[PDB]
């Protein structure tokens, strides 16, 4: 627990599940619907598969925006805001040092290792980077 020569800034990204409200003004878009269709494909020995199609064209009615949404309420946090770090060895799997014994020693000490987690307590780990 000596201080090495340099500090470090850690960056992490987090996810939040929210409920939103969308407002849309009247007569703000025009839709041209087409005619639906049925087709036949991938005929096999024991079954056939039909595909069903449809087409519509939309074009804006005014000049400016007509609808707007904003997160009305947060339901749950997902990422766990942890200390989990990104391992460079994993990100780059080809780079290496000169001496093979040094490389193996460094991997062993650092802990480079994929089903890393048989089970979780908090949620989807949020990768931290330095």
Partner 1 sequence: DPTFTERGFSKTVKSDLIAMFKRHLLEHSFFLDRAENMGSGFSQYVRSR
Partner 2 sequence: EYRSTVNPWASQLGSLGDIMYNSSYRQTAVPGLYSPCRAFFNKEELLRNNRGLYNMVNEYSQRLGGHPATSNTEVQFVVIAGTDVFLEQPCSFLQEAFPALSASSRALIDEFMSVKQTHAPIHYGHYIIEEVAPVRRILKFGNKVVF
Partner 3 sequence: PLNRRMQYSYYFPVGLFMPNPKYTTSAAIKMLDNPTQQLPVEAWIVNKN
Question: Residue 24: CB partners within 8 Å, gap ≥ 6?
Answer: 66, 67
Query: In the bound complex, what is the minimum distance in angstroms from residue 127's beta carbon to partner 3?
Result: 11
Which span (4-12, 30-38, 42-50, 55-63) binds partner 2, by CB under 8 A?
Answer: 4-12
Which one, 59 or 76, has the nearer CB to partner 1?
76
E strand or H helix that includes residue 69:
strand 67-77
Three-state DSSP class for 114? coil
Give backbone dihedrals phi and psi of 71, rounded to 5 degrees, phi first: -65, 115
Query: Can you give the binding site for partner 2, defined by CB under 8 A?
Result: 9, 11-13, 15-16, 74, 77-78, 81, 84, 86, 90-95, 116-117, 120, 124-129
């Amino acid at each position: 627990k000596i201080h090495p020569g340099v500090a470090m800034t850690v960056v992490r990204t987090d996810e939040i599940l929210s409920e939103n409200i969308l407002f849309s003004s009247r007569a703000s878009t025009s839709m041209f619907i087409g005619t639906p269709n049925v087709s036949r494909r991938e005929a096999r020995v024991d079954a056939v598969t039909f595909e069903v199609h449809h087409e519509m064209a939309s074009i804006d009615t005014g000049l400016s925006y007509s609808s707007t949404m904003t997160p009305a309420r947060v339901a749950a946090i997902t990422t766990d805001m942890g200390i989990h770090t990104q391992d460079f060895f994993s990100v780059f799997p080809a780079e290496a040092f000169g001496n093979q014994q040094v490389n193996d020693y460094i991997k062993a000490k650092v802990g480079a290792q994929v089903n890393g987690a048989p089970g979780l307590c908090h949620g989807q780990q949020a990768t931290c980077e330095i």
